[model samples]
Target: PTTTTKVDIAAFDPDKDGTIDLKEALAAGSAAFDKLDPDKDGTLDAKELKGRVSEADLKKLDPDNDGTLDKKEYLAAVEAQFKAANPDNDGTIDARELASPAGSALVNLIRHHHHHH
Candidate 1:
């Protein structure tokens, strides 16, 4: 399987305007969640999150102790990652900022789903 860092941002840029905004990122995140849920179960188990997130991190997102992450929890995780990358909190993530491995992985999730759909 390809790593999340390998995700292409061009696919996530829905507007094809050369930049990814919060809305686009969120949409991409949701799309990613759906794609990852291959079982169409509406949730992601540890196996689903495998290479995308660590077990400890997955536990953090499983606030309900359901041993799985719903769309809401998944999106929250993505939002948190986005915020972390946007130190200025300008509500936007640029190509330069996404150059970081961490940021790229988070952004990749958004794009990853686009390719699947």
Candidate 2:
């Protein structure tokens, strides 16, 4: 089991695009929720989230788990991470978001972070 970091969204760079795409974030978050949904249902009930997350973390992340992350929840997570990398809010993230600050950061970030474990 991987550890869920306070910087979970920040650390996982789905789409490998260097810049975290909102769509990717939503998809990945949803996937994580789905994985925890033992019943294979489309939504995650309290039972689904209970043991996986600490009481505090659960309160913060899963307000309502429809077996996936809602738009607001996903976006808020992505925005926090995006702002960290794109402090200027340029709407574009550089390669540093990936591994190096050079080359096609978006491609790298997407490739590296796009898929969920």
Candidate 3:
């Protein structure tokens, strides 16, 4: 077996600024949502979510209480994490901030790597 980031985090940085902004982050997250929603049901179910989100996070985001999340809800989750990571209130997140606990949580929502199962 083999594993590595392989520029996975950088994959979302289309601007290549070595930092991630809300626009870039949201783009990646929504893309992930589309790809994961093969059924095209316009929402992501529990099984579809898998490692991308946790059970508790799910409870917080599913405002409709439908046990599923639409693109809008998922994006809001990312936004919440983004704000959490940016406690400094700056506009961008550099390497150091991206490595913080909140940053890691946000990454789980959009990162290309997975499979904790």
Per residue, candidate 2 scores C-alpha lDDT tens digits across 1-117 of 443321233444534556545554444455444344455553433455544444454455434553333335443543445434543554555346433343222221122121133
For all candidates in order, the CA lDDT equals: 0.61, 0.41, 0.60
**Weakest lDDT window of 10 consecutive positions for candidate 3:** 1-10
Deviating ranges (above 4 Å) for candidate 2: 1-15, 45-47, 62-117
* lDDT tens per residue, model 1, 9-81: 4446634575578776776667667666666775876667657667776676556788667778667767767
| Better-scoring candidate (lDDT), 2 or 3 | 3
Candidate 3 displacement at residue 91 in angstroms: 2.3
Q: Write the per-residue lDDT of candidate 3 for residues 20-88, one digit (tens) a residue.
A: 778876776666565556566647765666665667765655667876677786666666677666658
Q: How many backbone clashes does candidate 2 have?
A: 13
TM-score of each: 0.65, 0.39, 0.65
Point to the candidate with the largest lDDT.
1
Stretch of 10 with least lDDT, candidate 2: 106-115
Superposition error at 76 for model 1 (Å): 2.6
Write the number of the candidate with greater lDDT, choosing between 1 and 2: 1
Candidate 1 whole-model C-alpha lDDT, 0 to 1: 0.61
Clashes of each: 0, 13, 0
Per-residue lDDT of 80 in model 3: 68
| Better structure of 1 and 3 per lDDT | 1
